[PDB]
Design a protein around this nucleic acid. Structure first.
Ligand SMILES: [Mg+2]
Ligand SMILES: [Mg+2]
Ligand SMILES: [Mg+2]
Length: 87
RNA sequence: UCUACCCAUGUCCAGGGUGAAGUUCAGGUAACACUGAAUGGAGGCCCGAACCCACGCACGUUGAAAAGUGCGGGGAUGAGG
């Protein structure tokens, strides 16, 4: 467990001090879980059930990224640079 | 001392072509795949002298020669000479 990743990408674009539901925070946590799960699948190549989990996370993260991009174009660009995404 | 195979140690193979893997960059996707370009220089790879071979024909047949010559021919970085 890491609230580290919360308090980092809360404060970058914080609505509240104890913001949790910011797209920033969500996308960041998704990015952390995605990347963790990828390295599981490097080892456990034929864990297909878990891999469907990955594809759902990826789809959530994409949809939240498309949401920012349409909402706040600058705020989107700051998030993808810090996480190191492309889209 | 010919020749067959082997062992040790040397050496030879003008030139030209083709463009494997890999790599890089770009694209590419959540990751990979995958795509393009450049690079790269593989091969009992290609064309072709030396060299090695001996497919066809002619000639020769008391020969220039007890196996050759002429004109073409095959291999030519290899299980090579
Ligand atoms: Mg050859
Ligand atoms: Mg040749
Ligand atoms: Mg000849």
């Amino acid at each position: 467990i890491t609230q580290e990743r919360k308090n980092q990408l809360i404060n970058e674009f914080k609505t509240h001090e104890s913001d949790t539901g910011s797209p920033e925070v969500q996308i960041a946590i998704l990015t952390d879980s995605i990347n963790n799960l990828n390295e599981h699948l490097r080892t456990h190549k034929k864990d297909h059930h878990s891999r469907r989990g990955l594809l759902k996370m990826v789809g959530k993260r994409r949809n939240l990224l498309t949401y920012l991009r349409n909402k706040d174009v600058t705020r989107y660009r700051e998030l993808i640079n810090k996480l190191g995404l492309r889209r």
